[PDB]
Amino acid sequence: PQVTLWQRPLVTIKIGGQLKEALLDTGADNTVLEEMSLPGRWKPKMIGGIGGFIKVRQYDQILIEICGHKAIGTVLVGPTPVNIIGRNLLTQIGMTLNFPQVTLWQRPLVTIKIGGQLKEALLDTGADNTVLEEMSLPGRWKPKMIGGIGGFIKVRQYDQILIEICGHKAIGTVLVGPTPVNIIGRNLLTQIGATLNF
Questions:
Q1: What domain of life does the native source organism fall in (predicted)?
Q2: Which of 18, 63, 165, 198 is a good FRET partner for 154, with 20 to 30 A between their CA atoms?
Q3: Range(s) for CATH 2.40.70.10 in the chain?
Q4: Under 8 Å CB-to-CB from 13, ≥6 apart: which residues?
C-alpha cells in the first residue's frame, strides 16, 4: 500500500491479543503505545519528545501485526498521547518515504532553507505541524501551544513562510520553539508530494 499524507497515516495493529490504531511515525526512533496490558517482564525507561520526557515500560521481543504485516521488536508502553509506530518496526514492514526514495534504517533527515538560513530537519509523518528550533524569522507571529509526548510547549506561529525542503519549495505555517529536533510535518510534506509506501 501507498499512503499520502493529507490525513494522519493511521493503521490497525494487533498486539498482545488486542486491536488498536496507531500512527505510522517516521519521526519516531521507537514505538510507543498508550497504557495497555502486556505479558511478561519489562524494564523502566525514560524517553523524550516535544514537551519533555515520560516514563515508559520497555517490552522487548513483542510480536505486533501492523496493517497485516508481522514484526517483532521493542515496544514502549506509557503516557503517550497517541499510539506511534516508530522506525524500529517501520523498517520490518518495508516502509519507505517517497517524494527520491528514503528507507527508514536511519532518521529521514533533509536539508532545508528557510529565512535565508540552512538547517537540517526530520521528515516526520507523525507530526501534523512543522516545528523548528529557536531561530530568527522575519515578520509577525502569534503565540501558540502545541502538545507532544512529554507535554506541551509554547511556540511562535509564522504563517505563509517559504521553505525549500530538499530542493522542493513549499509555503505554509512554521512553528518556532523549544522542540528537541527540527520537524517537517504533514502540512508541508503534502506540498512536496511525500508518500509512505510498504
A1: Viruses
A2: 165
A3: 1-99, 100-198
A4: 19, 20, 21, 22, 64, 65, 66, 67, 83, 85
Resolution of the experimentally solved model in angstroms: 1.6
User: Ramachandran region of residue 151, left (φ > 0), alpha (ψ -120 to 50) or beta?
Assistant: left
Q: Is 27 helix (H, G, I), strand (E, B) or coil?
A: coil
Task: Give yes or no for a contact between 62 and 86, defined as CB atoms under 8 angstroms apart.
Answer: no
> CA-to-CA distance for 170 and 186, rounded, in angstroms?
12
Listed in order, strand segments (DSSP E) in 94-150 are: 96-98, 101-102, 109-114, 117-123, 131-132, 142-148
In CATH terms, the fold of domain 1-99 is Cathepsin D, subunit A; domain 1 (2.40.70)
Please identify every residue annotated as catalytic: 124
Elucidation method: X-ray
CA 129 to CA 126: how far, in whole Å? 9
End-to-end CA distance of the chain: 6
Q: What is the CATH number of domain 100-198?
A: 2.40.70.10
